[PDB]
Amino acid sequence: SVSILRSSVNHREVDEAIDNILRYTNSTEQQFLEAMESTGGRVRIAIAKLLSKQTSGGSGGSKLGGSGGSRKDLSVKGMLYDSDSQQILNRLRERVSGSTAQSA
Incomplete structure (x- = not known):
């Protein structure tokens, strides 16, 4: 036996x-x-x-300041992932432009 198919709804x-x-x-x-x-x-x-x-x-901006130090930039190594901004913009533009409908 094998598992059933299951599409996402994200x-x-x-x-x-x-x-x-x-x-x-x-x-x-x-x-x-x-x-x-x-x-x-x-x-x-x-x-x-x-x-x-x-x-x-x-009348103007507030006073700001602080002590000196290093760049605090951390290690260069890591892994990439999706920015979600483009997914929000796609669902927002389809909701606004065409109601997220199946045809336009």
Whole structure:
């Protein structure tokens, strides 16, 4: 005997994560698609710009500083993995452009 076939559903989990980004940023998927298009598909920069689109303002920036040290850059060796930004952008653009429908 052998195991049965089992297809994945991870585009719904990415769609749920997109929906939770709309909920977190108090926005629409159209506004999040426009924020992603404006920021080059970086979800962190897109949600940052989509939050900070209107603010209280001020007279200038705050004071910053710290002690000297090394580069803290760590070892060069490692392994590659997917960035997820492109998967979120694909599911967001299909949800906005064509409702994630089977034909358009």
